[PDB]
């Protein structure tokens, strides 16, 4: 039940808690080899500087991840990178420093083919989370056979990443590797849900109280109560705005320029396990976990409003009892349950909180239903017949006329051309609808990574983006609006390109833009990198299906003006043909725009061009 869902047993949880306790006594991290498991526990810290960085000028100590170090932690189609707590990130970076021997120990554990486990209590858990992601980006994605799955186990950990963080974990199917135990009242998982200005004065004393290594010499009750109230007020704002933004308020004055009621960007990442005296409740849905983080820490189970802050401090230290009493607790998985009332009542969630958690779960169910309808629509034969007609009928018939379907559509002198236009419009409608669903976060996290969708969208892009470029230049939109690559390319094609590129490139750790610039620099054109990036600004040589676009921007101009761009296009063309991005039966035809333009190029260029064998008869 629990083991079938999380992939860890009670022995591993117990060893993880033992190592997390031991990590207090070791600098940065502690390594423990226990049978078939190797555990990396991280030393937690209770200094204010280790929750909100002193040099961070943002309201929540947040910072955007660097796309080179965490290339998967982003939205593929949109491009937006994930955001994490800067202090936890700096702690991770200080651990992974080559001078710490952490990386060498991790690689030695990888060679042993044992189950590698990153664990931690409090901020250590935070580091553990990041460490796991580090592993996932540096080893597991490169070769999942020699770099095996990690496990991440945290006890009372603060939130680490934002919604894009959790989304990227979900798309890569990495969230299943994370298990975050949270005792019902533990205040630490709720801290970074508050504006750092709301707790800036009371956080040091409460952190000293939360430190398991310190003695409680009966300090200050008032500061603890005020800290709890601040954290709960800001958490309430965040959770209620999540409720309103999920299906109620949409977008009214949500956007920036009005930094009035700033809400924390941090969201639950991975599986969470709430714990009472009698239950273990596992939750996957991040929005549900946020709503529960708010509503389980309320004065509701007995309405003992006066005692709940000290319970919130003591529950950060109650993971020993949690680990000792796991086997005697009743387990249930909230996401897959038919009725969530017993679990949330046992957790003290009010009726309104229960309705909000149910609403979050229902929204995830709606996203799954949307993906199901999308796959049924894209798998029926009446839909695929359009692409099949473009592939097996329109393209060969246009190759027979010796001009290619791009030019045949651009002139549109036959009825087949208008038929192709109709099918292009229908396909565009379907893909624009899917894109609109993606933009509004109304599909599962895994959608953009689904290999069936990637295959279909790549086929559609390769087949139909030439027809959309022909439609763009046929209606002279290049003169009214501008070049196709700058102000005319439909976003659906960008999404399809980015999904395909990420899928095929992520095992090597480089993003498509860096691969492109590496290839153009390997073309050895002999110019400065900034100058080349300026010449290839908004170029069509970054994606094969944009070939014609670049051609349209290069024909008519003198050779000295666009020599760099034409050589770059020619250098990309052969790999494009091999990959299937550009049809070699189309572009070299006698009536093709590209061939008619390529003949006009200087004969000295054609002599040393890689394409002279494809157009011998000029």
């Amino acid at each position, epitope marked *: 039940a629990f083991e079938a869902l999380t992939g860890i047993n009670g022995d591993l949880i117990t060893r993880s808690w033992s190592a997390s306790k031991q990590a207090y006594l070791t600098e940065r991290y502690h390594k423990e080899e226990a049978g078939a498991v190797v555990i990396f526990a991280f030393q937690p810290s209770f200094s204010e500087k280790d929750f909100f960085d002193p040099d961070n000028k943002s309201s929540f100590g947040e910072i955007k991840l660097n796309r080179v170090q965490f290339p998967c932690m982003r939205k593929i189609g949109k491009g937006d990178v994930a955001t994490v707590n800067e202090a936890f990130l700096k702690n991770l970076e200080a651990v992974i420093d080559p001078r710490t021997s952490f990386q060498a120990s991790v690689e030695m554990a990888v060679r042993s083919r044992k189950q590698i486990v990153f664990t931690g209590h409090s901020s250590g858990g935070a580091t553990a989370i990041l460490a796991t992601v580090w592993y996932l980006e540096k080893y597991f994605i490169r070769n999942p056979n020699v770099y095996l799955e990690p496990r991440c186990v945290t006890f009372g950990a603060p939130l680490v990443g934002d919604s894009i963080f959790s989304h990227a974990l979900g798309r890569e199917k990495w969230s299943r590797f994370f298990v975050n135990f949270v005792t019902r009242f533990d205040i630490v998982p709720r801290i970074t849900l508050a504006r750092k200005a709301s707790v800036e004065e009371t956080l040091p004393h409460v952190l000293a109280q939360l430190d398991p290594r*310190n003695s409680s010499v009966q300090e200050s009750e008032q500061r603890i109560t005020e800290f709890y109230t601040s954290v709960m007020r800001d958490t309430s704002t965040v959770a209620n705005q999540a409720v309103c933004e999920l299906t109620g308020s949409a977008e009214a004055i949500l956007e920036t320029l009005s930094s009035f009621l700033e809400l924390s960007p941090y969201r639950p990442a991975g599986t969470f396990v709430f714990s009472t005296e009698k239950r273990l409740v596992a939750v996957n849905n991040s929005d549900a976990i946020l709503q529960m983080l708010f509503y389980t820490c309320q004065a509701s189970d007995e309405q003992e409003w006066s005692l709940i802050p000290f319970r919130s401090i003591r529950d950060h230290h109650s993971y020993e009892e949690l680990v*000792q009493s796991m086997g005697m607790k009743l387990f249930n998985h909230l996401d897959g349950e038919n009725s969530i009332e017993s679990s949330l009542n046992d957790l003290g969630v009010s009726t309104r909180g229960r309705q909000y958690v149910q609403a979050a779960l229902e929204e995830e169910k709606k996203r799954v239903e949307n993906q199901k309808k999308i796959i049924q629509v894209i798998q029926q034969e009446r839909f695929l017949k359009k692409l099949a007609w473009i592939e097996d009928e329109y393209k060969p018939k246009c190759q027979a006329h010796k001009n290619g379907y791009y030019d045949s559509f651009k002139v549109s002198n036959e009825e087949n051309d208008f038929k192709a236009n109709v099918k292009r419009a229908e396909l565009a409608g379907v893909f624009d609808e899917v894109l609109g669903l993606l933009k509004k976060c109304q599909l599962p996290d895994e959608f953009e990574g689904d290999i069936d969708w990637i295959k279909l969208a790549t086929r559609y892009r390769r087949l139909v983006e030439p027809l959309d470029i022909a439609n763009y230049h046929r209606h002279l939109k290049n003169e009214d609006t501008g070049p196709y690559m700058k102000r005319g390319r439909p976003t659906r094609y960008i999404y399809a390109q980015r999904g395909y590129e990420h899928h095929i490139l992520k095992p090597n750790g480089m993003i498509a833009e860096d691969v492109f610039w590496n290839k153009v620099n390997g073309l050895n054109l002999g110019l400065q990198l900034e100058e080349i990036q300026e010449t290839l600004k908004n170029s069509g040589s970054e994606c094969g299906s944009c070939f014609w676009a670049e051609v349209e921007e290069l024909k008519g101009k003198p050779y000295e003006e666009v020599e760099v761009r034409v050589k770059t296009l020619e250098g990309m063309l052969r790999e494009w043909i091999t990959a299937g991005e550009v049809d070699e039966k189309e572009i070299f035809l006698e009536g093709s725009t590209f061939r008619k333009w390529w003949i006009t190029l200087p004969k000295n260029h054609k002599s040393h061009s890689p394409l002279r064998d494809y157009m011998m008869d000029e």
Partner: nanobody, 124 residues
Framework: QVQLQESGGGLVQAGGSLRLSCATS????????MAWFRQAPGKEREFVAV????????DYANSVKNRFTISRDNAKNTVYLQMNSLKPEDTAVYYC?????????????????WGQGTQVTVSS
């Protein structure tokens, strides 16, 4: 759950010494705060000595400080309380307890695991 078993109690003349042992089922160094408590007939379970998980530091109740000694053999997984200058009022059942994080050493509620206890009777 740590298993704790006390042994070594018995009858001792006033002024004598006696060593009590507490076998633990797992290593407790940097893992559990280990304490000795005692309960006399009718009275309540009061604190005697502590060895902290945090820093390996020892502390004692004022009635036993500088005459009792708490220690641990980490190899044998054993915690000892050596008692000296015993008085008839030290007659009690002695327990060893394990807890975490035990931010209040003298409170019995901080300790999650306990032993069955061993009787110590000091005669006049």
């Amino acid at each position: 759950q740590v298993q704790l078993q006390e042994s070594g109690g018995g009858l001792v003349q006033a002024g004598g010494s006696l060593r009590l042992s507490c076998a633990t089922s797992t290593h407790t160094a940097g893992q559990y705060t280990m304490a000795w408590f005692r309960q006399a007939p009718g009275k309540e379970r009061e604190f005697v000595a502590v060895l902290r998980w945090s820093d390996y530091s020892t502390d004692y109740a004022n009635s036993v400080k500088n005459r009792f000694t708490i220690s641990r053999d980490n190899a044998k997984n054993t915690v000892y309380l050596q008692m000296n200058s015993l008085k008839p009022e030290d007659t009690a059942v002695y327990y060893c307890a394990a807890g975490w994080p035990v931010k209040v050493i003298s409170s019995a509620d901080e300790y999650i695991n306990w032993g069955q206890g061993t009787q110590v009777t000091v005669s006049s």
